[PDB]
Amino acid sequence: SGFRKMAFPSGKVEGCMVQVTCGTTTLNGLWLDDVVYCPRHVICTSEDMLNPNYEDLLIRKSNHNFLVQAGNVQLRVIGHSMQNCVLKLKVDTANPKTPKYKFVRIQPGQTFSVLACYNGSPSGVYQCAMRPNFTIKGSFLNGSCGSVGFNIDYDCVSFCYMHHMELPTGVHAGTDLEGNFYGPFVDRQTAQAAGTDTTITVNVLAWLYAAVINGDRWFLNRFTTTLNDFNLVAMKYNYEPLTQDHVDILGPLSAQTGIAVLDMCASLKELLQNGMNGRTILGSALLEDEFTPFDVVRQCS
Amino acid sequence: SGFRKMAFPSGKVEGCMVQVTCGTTTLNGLWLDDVVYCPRHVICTSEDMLNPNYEDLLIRKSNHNFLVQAGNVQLRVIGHSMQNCVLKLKVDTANPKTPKYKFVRIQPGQTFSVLACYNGSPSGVYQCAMRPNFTIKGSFLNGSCGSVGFNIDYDCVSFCYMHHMELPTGVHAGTDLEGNFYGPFVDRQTAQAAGTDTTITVNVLAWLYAAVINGDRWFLNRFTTTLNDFNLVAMKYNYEPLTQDHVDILGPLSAQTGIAVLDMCASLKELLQNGMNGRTILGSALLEDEFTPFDVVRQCS
């Protein structure tokens, strides 16, 4: 019993973190096989970030301008290239600690673990969600750029995120490991606002099922509802629309608990319209939306 | 910016987790140097847990009855002994992955990371607190006994907790790595209730300081208060009494923010007497108490 926001064990990723320096700028890189991946704004001064021409800044750099240090040892850089918003630094030594791995581009609402790093050194690990507006609400102090997000499937690490930017609102933006930003953000220090931060409905439902499984049942009511009727309520409260695909993903949790998905939607509707009346669910006074249905099953199993 | 409950990077601990089997019972062990540490109730049947005589059950076991597997390899057991509530299994091979480490017995209110494991395999990592009543609110499914809690200081891992029991209330109890239980609990499947679960006042204050540093300021008010006056309020709301030692530990956060500790106590008093009026602090609708002052400084630095 008990329900906690758990991150994946970080060891496989710790062994890939390196330090990358170019001129006066230092951040984190990811060393896999003989390639080091890092945010391209490693080549920018604090002044260049207003309006960088990355292609022009990059021509002024040669292989020997990129310093790459794994722990207390220097890697030799034998090639460099820019792929979208990431730099790929070819080194002459394959990382002996490279796990089995994949690069994946995740969908909004999916969760992953972040290994927050500074100067190539692991600081902490936490679990979060890609928001529907493609931001993450993270913990990134100066220097944590290049820290990565991942999921682990048995022995294979699926890297899905690299931290690049803090937006003026305090939320974080970054890319997949091919260097494509999640959402409309760009690697420039300019006014970019996030759209509306909606709640991930299918995750709240999964978390409500977790609550039932762990004994918190007070919020279950005697009503049911329909998809269209619930979705009118969802729209009002800035919740993501619920689809039949989402109902299907919740199937195993419905089966485990014997609570129909639409019954749970009607419980959720009443919590949205009534609040919690000073009560809690799984120790929380708010509706939690950073557990996917797969997470809940994983943690309960 | 941003504030998240972060666990320590788990890699140094992942490399120490092993599987320990004795008869039909399997749980997790911790392999450091040439000793494997695990809960002594590995020698119990599900039936023995009603009322075990551990000394009598242990005489029926010899070195070869303890199966210890690190990944897919078997360790050779050359000695066994019982130290309080843990078994120490002497093996013939030192763990090549042993980090620099210490055994420490933590105080109530201190935090640590847990690496939840099953059958010797790491499942997830999360940060929690030793409650003032010496329980932890964890995530432990069948088989996670022997999972451990730790803090990391640079390169040294301070092991402070081993999971042993789930109490009938759903909270968790365990020992230090010398096998002494935290609190009054025993390793027997019997009625043991936890005392009153009070809130860790100095941690709430630290978290309120974190909130100020990250821009959430609405709860700051125009009042101040005294230690004795605040502590009357603390007693009413089942908060731990605040001492001058606690005021002192908060000193650096007071300095950073320019908010006197007693000013922040008066903010806390009003939140305790008024609630949050449907507002949030650092994304939470409740007062968070599982960040120590040291955590807050660490994460902000």
Ligand SMILES: [Au+]
């Ligand atoms: Au793979």
Ligand SMILES: [Au+]
């Ligand atoms: Au940065």
Ligand SMILES: [Au+]
């Ligand atoms: Au040490």
Ligand SMILES: [Au+]
């Ligand atoms: Au167990």
